[PDB]
Symmetry: D2
Subunit: 242 residues, 4 copies
């Protein structure tokens, strides 16, 4: 599917290798389908996410067609674990598409975009090579590329770009992607949402504050109260005390 | 697709993402199929290969289920650009199957003793993670292996080579056969430009420059089929 | 610079590029030393770590000479973000060096080893190729290699292999590495220990538990008590109470 | 130490882990120095480079401090096998510096308006992460770049080539100069087998075959000092 982002950008799922069944299959190193029952697979998938057994999640891959402003592309490319192919401003002539914000944030644009695209056109008409000509163009220029990444590293990407510390523009792109992943690998996504996205890492002193303020028994009741049992429960306790 | 390798192992294709069309499609950063006639695309594929524009080749991925003896897997795992998930000797119990070579480029004795001490330790209740410890390096293991085409070619170029230990090479042969059928246009380009090709040093080229002449070389090249940018490029590598 | 592990293994620092000052220098992109003050830098380091600004940590690199049992090596190499060069069992004669456990964990060795090695020299004596002959040796055979990895990934490796869930044998190796690293980049290690090794990751239901069992004002006092104040206290609090 | 590039850029060696000795030392998994004679270590380095035994080359690491135009940095960052930390336009205020090309293959006006708008945006209280989007691709950026010798070599092979864009080719030339000085043996081998060598497809080695003979080839090869294993290799690529 395709999803619009910003004024002129988008995210489109080009291909996909495997779904929730693939994670479980690779985890069981099966000769066949490697599946069982959905709550059993959800359980296994939940377990793998919890214990950082990441290999199984790398057996699923997504490939997208993304159109975005160069400044968003650069933050996106900071992620080295992916395969990318971008439209080169060296061979191709660049389309006059710019990202115009809904509104600027605290803490003229149209003009410089014009002058600049003017200069770009002028330079080109004088015969100046493309590769050099495109330098006078601003960072809000749109650009397209193919982004290929495995589920494990895509979750990593989402955790970072979905965080409120990531620049708003790229957050929106991460939201689009998150939506596509949620529909395509719902079980894996369920685990990701529960354990990482909606979770939090606590430093040593934080865990130490939990101790002193609470006892095992008390914590346990509170947890089971919410529906945790067996390993999940034991582990949750072993995270604070054991 | 489950090709056998060795007396008990095998290489099987679990899944694949994209084919020759995907290489071209990604190279063009298409909104649709991203294709054209099989002549333009195979041409584009050969070109990308030649010029090291390798990204497009990374847009195609294969995932195999492999069974091989541990000592073969250790060599296989030196390749880091891949994802793998193997049967943990920690969690599960290991089947009694070893690599019994057909010819040698007693072995029964050790395996039995080793597998014997295995059950022994297990029987006495020693942790599985320490029990398999006594198992020989020819014990069989199993794993899933996912890797993109570009890095798979790199894997093939290295493991198909005569220097590569024989066993690993068989496994590479198995894989190579599979890749060829699934990405024909790419396999060909890989077969002509890298696998069956070679890298020449500077003094090897000065030698060529000293024996042949441009005119001479051009004629022997083209008479063999080379034409187009491939001809100009091959002539520049030397002159 | 050498720390023995197990009965015949060890870990020795071969070289090192950069130290705490390198982390801080890179984060700044200096043309000079890039170092301010142990206080100010220790603060930048702790900041980068808890905020996942991992690139600066990749500017520090360690290279080790390791001797450990093959089986341990297999677990070690699962980590793909490192460079490694191992003595080949195709070119050399593996020295009859085996790992005899301190004690067996519950969840003849001498015999199998003896026999196995004898089969090895036998095959060699019969003229069998090295690469093949070594196939009859047990996974507990000692091997050697050089292992180079950057701080960021090294912390990753330590976080996983220091864990109780990890096999005892490799934990020991991790412990030796941890020592060496704690000595050379004290500030990075302190941050690591605080925000990852001794920290923990809590799921959504878990935080749901804490929130409810506690109250903002209270959690704040326990946190502040142990020293938390500032952005950390802010954060720590927000992780549980919106 | 510091090599200037273009009109305002530069390449600086910030630190280095190992030299030719570390390649050989690791290749040997040595308990100590793991080195021998400069002649044997050069021979061993040439063999590893020639047979693609690349792990040892990864034991050497270079850390650079680079200042280049954003568009140059974008090409540079295609290389994933490296660590980088760049000054962020989300935190600091970017300096007004551009790459005024000596000759092309107006620009001032756009750059001024651009920095002008950028400055006028900052003053209006606009957020840095947003204001810098009006700046052009020839704006100078800075970053640290850490890469091991093996990957660095791959990098120089591609960015030094005629195909590579001119501006990044100049940055590669600078890095090449520093590497040549610091790992001379590794460099000589890289120059000899890669940089100045060439890859020949099958039909190319086919054209060479028949159009010559093992003897007519060894002659010219030997007349260049080539002998031993190398000469056996040169011969088999065509025949063998
Ligand atoms: C709050 C915040 C502030 C930031 N500020 C800055 C800044 O000022 N300047 C700046 O340049 N960046 C900055 N970054 C970006 C950051 O440094 C990373 O480059 C980016 O977040 C990508 O994370 P990643 O590398 O782990 O993901 P990936 O690139 O996808 O890599 C994922 C993991 O794979 C491993 N890996 C992949 N490739 C390599 C490799 N070549 N070598 C070693 N290990 C590898 C690593 O363990 C890595 O963590 C900031 C990020 C955040 C969250
Ligand atoms: C003749 C010969 C002798 C050999 N002898 C030995 C030996 O004695 N001991 C031994 O251990 N190995 C030996 N090897 C193995 C060799 O050194 C490589 O480990 C193996 O060939 C894998 O090649 P690769 O790393 O390029 O493939 P990959 O592992 O898939 O990596 C591919 C490329 O990606 C990049 N890359 C991947 N991971 C990283 C990373 N973590 N950091 C930086 N860059 C990365 C590199 O550019 C690398 O070349 C030998 C190989 C040959 C051909
Ligand atoms: C509880 C538990 C159980 C496990 N069980 C098993 C098992 O049964 N079988 C098994 O084989 N393994 C198992 N593992 C190992 C696990 O699957 C990983 O292989 C290992 O933990 C390495 O983690 P890593 O890849 O993140 O570290 P690294 O290999 O150093 O990589 C670090 C990060 O860099 C990126 N990266 C590095 N290399 C690649 C690459 N080639 N492709 C894509 N991204 C890359 C990834 O984001 C990765 O997280 C288990 C681990 C745990 C904790
Ligand atoms: C003539 C030419 C034209 C080009 N045109 C374009 C273009 O139009 N658009 C465009 O986007 N790019 C283009 N490129 C860039 C090219 O596709 C590569 O991205 C770039 O040259 C880096 O090569 P590299 O990936 O091998 O270097 P590195 O990024 O350092 O990777 C080195 C090697 O390590 C391994 N590796 C590293 N990271 C990963 C990973 N995440 N997954 C799997 N394996 C990995 C691979 O084996 C890889 O070959 C072009 C290059 C050339 C030479």
């Amino acid at each position: 599917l395709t999803i619009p982002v910003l004024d002129k950008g988008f995210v489109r799922l080009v291909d996909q290798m495997g779904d929730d069944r693939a994670i479980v299959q690779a985890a069981r190193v099966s000769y066949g389908e490697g599946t069982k029952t959905v709550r059993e697979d959800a359980a296994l998938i939940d377990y793998l996410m919890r214990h950082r057994h990441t290999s199984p999640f790398e057996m699923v891959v997504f490939k997208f067609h993304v159109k975005a402003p160069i400044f968003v592309a650069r933050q996106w490319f900071r992620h080295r674990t992916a395969s990318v192919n971008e439209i080169s401003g060296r061979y191709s002539i660049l389309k006059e598409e710019f990202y115009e914000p809904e509104a600027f944030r605290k803490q003229l644009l149209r003009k410089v975009q014009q002058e600049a695209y003017g200069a770009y056109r002028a330079l080109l008409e004088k015969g100046v090579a493309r590769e050099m000509a495109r330098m006078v163009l601003p960072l809000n220029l749109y650009t397209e590329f193919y982004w290929k990444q495995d589920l494990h590293n895509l979750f990593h990407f989402l955790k970072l770009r979905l965080a409120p510390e990531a620049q708003w523009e790229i957050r929106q792109y991460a939201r689009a992607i998150a939506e596509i992943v949620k529909e395509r690998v719902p079980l894996a996504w369920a685990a990701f949402e529960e354990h990482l996205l909606e979770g939090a890492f606590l430093s040593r002193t934080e865990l130490r504050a939990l101790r002193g303020l609470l006892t095992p028994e008390v914590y346990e009741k509170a947890l089971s109260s919410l529906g945790l049992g067996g390993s999940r429960l034991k582990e949750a306790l072993e995270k604070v005390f054991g």
